[PDB]
Design an enzyme around this catalytic site. Structure first.
Site, PDB file in Angstrom:
ATOM      1  N   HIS A  83       0.703  -1.929   1.515  1.00  0.00           N
ATOM      2  CA  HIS A  83       0.049  -3.103   0.902  1.00  0.00           C
ATOM      3  C   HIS A  83       0.888  -3.585  -0.293  1.00  0.00           C
ATOM      4  CE1 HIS A  83      -2.065  -0.031  -1.558  1.00  0.00           C
ATOM      5  NE2 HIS A  83      -2.340  -0.984  -2.431  1.00  0.00           N
ATOM      6  N   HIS A  85       0.542  -3.782  -3.712  1.00  0.00           N
ATOM      7  CA  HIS A  85       0.566  -3.211  -5.057  1.00  0.00           C
ATOM      8  C   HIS A  85       1.850  -2.431  -5.334  1.00  0.00           C
ATOM      9  CE1 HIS A  85      -4.113  -3.510  -5.280  1.00  0.00           C
ATOM     10  NE2 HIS A  85      -3.537  -4.602  -5.748  1.00  0.00           N
ATOM     11  N   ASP A  87       2.598   0.534  -6.250  1.00  0.00           N
ATOM     12  CA  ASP A  87       2.785   1.887  -5.706  1.00  0.00           C
ATOM     13  C   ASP A  87       3.235   1.893  -4.237  1.00  0.00           C
ATOM     14  OD1 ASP A  87       0.208   1.037  -5.070  1.00  0.00           O
ATOM     15  OD2 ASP A  87      -0.660   3.046  -5.068  1.00  0.00           O
ATOM     16  N   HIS A 148      -9.499  -1.725   0.482  1.00  0.00           N
ATOM     17  CA  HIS A 148      -8.895  -1.615  -0.850  1.00  0.00           C
ATOM     18  C   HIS A 148      -8.210  -2.923  -1.261  1.00  0.00           C
ATOM     19  CE1 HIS A 148      -6.449  -0.012  -4.171  1.00  0.00           C
ATOM     20  NE2 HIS A 148      -5.454  -0.675  -3.610  1.00  0.00           N
ATOM     21  N   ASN A 179      -9.670   0.937  -8.529  1.00  0.00           N
ATOM     22  CA  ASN A 179      -9.237  -0.463  -8.696  1.00  0.00           C
ATOM     23  C   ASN A 179      -9.771  -1.287  -7.524  1.00  0.00           C
ATOM     24  OD1 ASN A 179      -7.895  -2.918  -9.251  1.00  0.00           O
ATOM     25  ND2 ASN A 179      -5.856  -2.143  -8.711  1.00  0.00           N
TER      26      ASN A 179
END
Ligand SMILES: [Mg+2]
Ligand SMILES: [Zn+2]
Ligand SMILES: [Zn+2]
Length: 226
Positions: A83, A85, A87, A148, A179
């Site tokens: 995804h 983000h 990380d 998420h 988050n």
């Protein structure tokens, strides 16, 4: 034996054997005062390696490549980010520097651009609607739906029944959603069910953050989402 935030300084990476030709990579990162750990995956294909997700930033991703080259001794030739983000895409420019062919879904590239994050170079087309699946070397890449984040993918390695759930799956000890600024809490339960129904023989389920478990982790995530 599985590494946690307590045994890895920020800027180091550790690998952990999950099965034949499958490792997780674990790194750490501080946002403000808080230090977190983060998981990705490494999958052997012939005499090369497919990387799932960065190690959360350029410094960590350089050290990831160095650890991979020490412990395994085969090149990372392609990568997939699960995804948008940091990380997952944070350190993609390190991968490109090293000659890695970086992939993600088209949506992930758009969202990453919108967030000012690094953008994988190539699109996995045919991953656009909930339920879509494509084969990619030794793995399946499945887009199960929003959870998420709107774009989150999971990766299953069929040879050895390993499911990298990424950040759409919570670890056993986690009791808060986390988050949820990009989350779709309404859809997250249906997304998890699609995952459970698709991969019922998974022996190990690896979350985006924390300790691996089995398929119990999927329903645990539906419980945490309320
Ligand atoms: Mg960012
Ligand atoms: Zn995320
Ligand atoms: Zn995450």
């Amino acid at each position: 034996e599985y590494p946690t935030v307590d045994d890895i300084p920020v800027g180091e990476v550790r690998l952990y054997k999950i099965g034949d030709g499958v490792w997780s990579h674990i790194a750490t990162q501080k946002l403000g005062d808080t230090v977190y750990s983060s998981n990705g995956l490494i999958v052997r294909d012939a005499d090369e390696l497919l990387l799932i997700d960065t190690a959360w930033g350029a410094k960590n991703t350089v050290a990831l490549l160095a650890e991979i080259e020490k412990q395994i001794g085969l090149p990372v030739t392609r990568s997939i980010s699960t995804h948008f983000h940091d990380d997952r895409v944070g350190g993609v420019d390190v991968l490109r520097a090293a000659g890695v062919a970086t992939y993600t879904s088209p949506l992930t590239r758009q969202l990453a651009e919108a967030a000012g994050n690094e953008v994988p170079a190539h699109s996995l087309k045919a991953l656009s609607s909930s339920g879509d699946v494509v084969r990619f070397g030794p793995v399946e890449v499945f887009y199960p739906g929003a959870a998420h984040s709107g774009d989150n993918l999971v990766v299953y390695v069929p040879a050895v029944r390993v499911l990298f759930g990424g950040c759409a799956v919570h670890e056993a000890s986690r009791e808060s959603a986390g988050n949820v600024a990009d989350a779709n809490l309404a859809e997250w339960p249906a997304t998890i069910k699609r995952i459970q129904q698709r991969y019922p023989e998974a022996e190990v389920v690896i979350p985006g953050h924390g300790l691996p478990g089995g398929l119990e982790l999927l329903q645990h995530t539906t419980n945490v989402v309320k």
